[PDB]
Amino acid sequence: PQVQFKLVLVGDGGTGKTTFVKRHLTGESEKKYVATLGVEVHPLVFHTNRGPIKFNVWDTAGQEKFGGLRDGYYIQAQCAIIMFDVTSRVTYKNVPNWHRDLVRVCENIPIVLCGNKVDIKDRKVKAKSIVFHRKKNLQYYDISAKSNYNFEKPFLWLARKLIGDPNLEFVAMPALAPPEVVMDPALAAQYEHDLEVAQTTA
């Protein structure tokens, strides 16, 4: 039995949404363009200890702002990723706008917030400054699409929430495009610790 979920990937233009979803090579080769909506749906299979899960990831073809996506985009969304760029504070300021736009149409679906491009040393939205809330349907991760850093974590968290199994594991990583940049491991270690503390002090 294969379960599938519609996942809406939203966020300001230029934050790396397309670069991120395209890391999953089979999802890219089997992507479907939806002409009526201007959307590419990437069917991303992940292999868990309980069988395969498919996240059908909706990625926009344009540079829409919050509230600028056609209505069909959000219809029957079962989970979401909101993405911003840690080198552009405006894209983070707009995260609450995307979040509000989501909860208006989809109500209580699990959502992951992703700060992308953490491979860039000059980080403007610092790990310690990331706003954490009491929401149990919300989670944050740093990511670097171009290095595959933390690529699987948003999907693993959503899968655990959706399936209701906090011990769900991926038994193998998906085939990903080779990294194009290096994620500095000292920064990664520091970011991860900084986030544990901000996630714990709240």
Binding site: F5, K32, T36, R50, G72, I163
Partner: protein, 38 residues
Amino acid sequence: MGFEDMFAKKEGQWDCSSCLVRNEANATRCVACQNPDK
């Protein structure tokens, strides 16, 4: 273990071949992308 089939297709539901959204039996085109069932 497998997956608890509370995510499985219910009676008469169909998956849109254009956008993969799951539709109800009485829908003749996709509620999301409006492509006709084919």
